[PDB]
Amino acid sequence: MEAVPRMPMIWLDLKEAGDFHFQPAVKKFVLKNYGENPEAYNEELKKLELLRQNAVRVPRDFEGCSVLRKYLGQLHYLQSRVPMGSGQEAAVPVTWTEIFSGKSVAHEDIKYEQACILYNLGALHSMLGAMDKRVSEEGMKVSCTHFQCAAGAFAYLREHFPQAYSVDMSRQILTLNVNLMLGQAQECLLEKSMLDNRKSFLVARISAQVVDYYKEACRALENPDTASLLGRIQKDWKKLVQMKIYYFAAVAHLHMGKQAEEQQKFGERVAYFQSALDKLNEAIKLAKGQPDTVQDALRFTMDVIGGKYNSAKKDNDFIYHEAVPALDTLQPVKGAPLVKPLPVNPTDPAVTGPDIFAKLV
């Protein structure tokens, strides 16, 4: 299974930004409350404007993630010197487009701008993670890290912005994004564990965790309120995720049979291989009409599982003559979560650079 064709990955679109006329509010606040000439801050305002323009039209590469984190930190610095939150003195309208409706949403709240930048940080990470072919340990490692970063951005957004400014950033939807991103990260790690030919039991646990993450995401997609909001998107996501649930259940039980093989339990080996074959056949049914990338991975895995099942049954029928335990006799594999939402630190000086408004008293 070292060279199994790579499954495709889901990514989220970035949000489109509208106006954020912070310049008049900062100049007004600077004169009124700091007693300084507002024109003395034209250079600082130019820098923040150039940073926002770069961040809202972020280059869809690795360096784009740094631009978003840098801008996010500078927004925290500004809010600590000029109050632009809800009901505060220098608050101005912030406008972004909501993903599912395509409609403009405006809030007079700088934390709404922070929230959208952090969503797009996770969205961009999901994009970069899904772009790679994962045929190199460098691209496999980068993709695994990207999906973990995406989970962390959405997780940070879920925790520190429980006021859902729009429905695409609501708790239930962000929870779906986090679980989906963690499943794809664990999936990348699974491909690595099978490349190294790690112990069979650990690979089973790693694949079983892929299943667990995708099962959590599939539950959210089957929620009627999530399905009505996502619309067609729920249909496309649920098709890939539901198939992957059975695909990686098959991979998990394939390696449980390998453990049974290593433990000289040749009747138990038949039971796990037959289970893996059944689960993979269900994944094949679920993959009708899916791209060739999915078909090529199922077909490769079928050659492995199908051959190993036939060989194991032949060995048991004519050599070992051991009892084949039922399906419901077997302890279910416990997933081994070896990925995590990588933390977001908004005011990390290494990611923000100097405070743009450091001279503002």
Binding site: K141, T145, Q148, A185, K192, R198, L202, A336, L338, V339
Partner: peptide, 11 residues
């Protein structure tokens, strides 16, 4: 062992 190598790889 196997886990520690894979855990460090994923960080």
């Amino acid at each position: 062992d196997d886990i520690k190598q894979l855990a460090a790889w994923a960080t």
